[PDB]
Every structure is written in structure tokens, then in C-alpha cells.
């Protein structure tokens, strides 16, 4: 919910343009004059002043004027809470922006409540099982991963996957991305079998999309290697996400002792 109004569009791009060229001496004053032009007409407490302040704070983020950027975003959220009301998407967008600024400075705990309030705002407007609520749960999981809150990471990624897998298709990359992230969280907890099953699920859907339903012949890539451990190969290296899975599960078979299985999986990933 970060819609930039028609008027500010050109000036906004010009700001971004100058702030990318590292022409801060031009960008900051353009922002500052635009703010005075906005209060002349609209008054401080306005959605456009809030928009214009958020832009400047991101220019102060680029400069590493982190205290200025934080203050500017607090003022912007304050305007957005009056004008647009609390529990507004613009209010959610600002809290996420403020949490991203805090995480950057390593203030992960400080960024945690902001992220939690925004997810609460997202759930109210979009619905509990909305795909954007899933993107928020994923972001809140990263926040906990950085704090080493292993259990919290698993809960958040588990909630996210619930939304992704049911609301979107199984073939969706967001689903595979979550299952790989959650499996990683499991590996940290020592929930090896849980992560292994997750990897297998990924590989099995990939295989099914390529070569229809799994029957007697046309067994998946993993199932071919696990059978190889007792003694041709058609495997598609379509996605980078599918390689991470192949490499991961391979290493996991090396831990199990199923070395030939780890090998063939490594080879398919190499191919």
C-alpha cells in the first residue's frame, strides 16, 4: 500500500535519479523544497507530506543518516495514523520501512514489534490467509532467524507455507522457496527427517510437472538414488531453487551414509 500520487511521480523519480547518481546535494534540497510546497497547500498532517517525508528518509538511509531517516519515518507514520487512520496499508508500509531501517543497523529486536504490528494490519485488511500476509510472515521469520529464535522461525515459515501452498499452486516458486527455508530451520534444530521429507516433496512436484504422475517407471530423482544404494536418469535442472534442494538433500544422504544417493543427487544438480 505504497501508492505515489500523480503529482509527486515526476519529482519522485528525479529524487531517486539524483540520489542514485550520489548527487545528494541536489536530492535532499529537492525533497526539502517539495515538503515546504506541500505544507503551503495541504498542511503538515497530509498523506502527500507523509509520502514526501518517506522518500527523504530513504535518501537519508542511502547517505547513512540513520537517525535522521528513523525520525523522518516516525513523523511520516504519525501523519498516516491521523490522516489515513491506524490499521491502514500506508501505515503498514511505513512500519515495514522503519523495521527495515532497524534491521539494517542490527536492531532486530526493535524491528520485531513494528513488523508484528504491520502483519496485524495486513491480516485485518487482506484476510488471515492472504498471500501478502504470507510474504509478511516470511519477513517476520527472517527477523527471528537473525535473533536466533529457531522455534519462532519454524512457526512463521510454517504459517507462510500454509498460505502459499493452499492459496497458490503447488508449482509456485514461493512454495518451494518456503519449503527450502523451513527445511533449513529444521536442520538447525536437528529435525533432520523433517527437512529430508520437505526436500523430497519439492523434488517430487518438480518431477511430476515435467513427466506427469509418478508410476512404476518414471520414479523421481531421489527414489532413483535411494534404489541405487541397494546395488538411466531423466532429471530437469529448471530452477535454481530446485538445485539448492538437490544439493541440500544430497549432503543429507551423505550424513545418512547413503553415499551413492548423495552422489547421483550431486551429479543431477551439477548437470
Amino acid at each position: 500500500g505504497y501508492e505515489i500520487p500523480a503529482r509527486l511521480r515526476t519529482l519522485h523519480n528525479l529524487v531517486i535519479q539524483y540520489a542514485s547518481q550520489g548527487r545528494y546535494e541536489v536530492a535532499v534540497p529537492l525533497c526539502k523544497q517539495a515538503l515546504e510546497d506541500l505544507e503551503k497547500t495541504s498542511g503538515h498532517d497530509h498523506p502527500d507530506v507523509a509520502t514526501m517525508l518517506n522518500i527523504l528518509a530513504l535518501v537519508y538511509r542511502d547517505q547513512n543518516k540513520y537517525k535522521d531517516a528513523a525520525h523522518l519515518l516516525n513523523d511520516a507514520l504519525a501523519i498516516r495514523e491521523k490522516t489515513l487512520g491506524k490499521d491502514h496499508p500506508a501505515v503498514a508500509a511505513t512500519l515495514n520501512n522503519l523495521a527495515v531501517l532497524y534491521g539494517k543497523r542490527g536492531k532486530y529486536k526493535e524491528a520485531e514489534p513494528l513488523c508484528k504490528r504491520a502483519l496485524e494490519i495486513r491480516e485485518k485488511v487482506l484476510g488471515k490467509f492472504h498471500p501478502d500476509v504470507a510474504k509478511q510472515l516470511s519477513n517476520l521469520a527472517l527477523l527471528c532467524q537473525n535473533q536466533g529464535k529457531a522455534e519462532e522461525v519454524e512457526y512463521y515459515y510454517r504459517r507462510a507455507l500454509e498460505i502459499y501452498a493452499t492459496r497458490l499452486g503447488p508449482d509456485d516458486p514461493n512454495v518451494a522457496k518456503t519449503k527450502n527455508n523451513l527445511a533449513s530451520c529444521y536442520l538447525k534444530q536437528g529435525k533432520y527427517q523433517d527437512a529430508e521429507t520437505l526436500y523430497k516433496e519439492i523434488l517430487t512436484r518438480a518431477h511430476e510437472k515435467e513427466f506427469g504422475s509418478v508410476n512404476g517407471e518414471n520414479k523421481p530423482i531421489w527414489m532413483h538414488a535411494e534404489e541405487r544404494e541397494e546395488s538411466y536418469k531423466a532429471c530437469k535442472v529448471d530452477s535454481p531453487t530446485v538445485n539448492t534442494t538437490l544439493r541440500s538433500l544430497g549432503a543429507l544422504y551423505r550424513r545418512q551414509g547413503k553415499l551413492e544417493a548423495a552422489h547421483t543427487l550431486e551429479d543431477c544438480a551439477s548437470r
Binding site: 528525479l14 548527487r23 546535494e25 541536489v26 536530492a27 535532499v28 534540497p29 529537492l30 523544497q33
Partner: protein, 61 residues
């Protein structure tokens, strides 16, 4: 007087920074208007070339 001079020097510098930023943007905006007016003259030619081609096709089919 000294306090007043200091404040005027601060304000003069702030004003100068803004004036030069505004001059930079104004120059860039003129060049974008010139690039656009030239590009619209190109497109106006392309549209009136195809408008004549509309009649040329109908004379055959």
C-alpha cells in the same frame, strides 16, 4: 549583531544550496522537454506516414 550575522550566513548558505539544486533540476527538466518535443515530432511523422498508407492499402484491397 554577531549572532544575527551568523544566522544570515547560515540562511544564505541553505538558500544557495537549494537555488543551485533547483537550477540543476530546471536545466534537466528543459532537456527532457526538448527530448520529448523532438520525439513527439518523430511519432507525429510516423503516424501521418501510416495514415497515408491506410488509403494506399484500400486502393488495392
Amino acid at each position: 549583531m554577531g549572532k544575527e550575522v551568523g544566522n544570515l550566513l547560515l540562511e544564505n548558505s541553505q538558500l544557495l544550496e537549494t537555488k543551485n539544486a533547483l537550477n540543476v533540476v530546471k536545466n534537466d527538466l528543459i532537456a527532457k522537454v526538448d527530448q520529448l518535443s523532438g520525439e513527439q515530432e518523430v511519432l507525429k511523422g510516423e503516424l501521418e506516414a501510416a495514415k497515408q498508407a491506410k488509403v494506399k492499402l484500400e486502393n488495392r484491397i
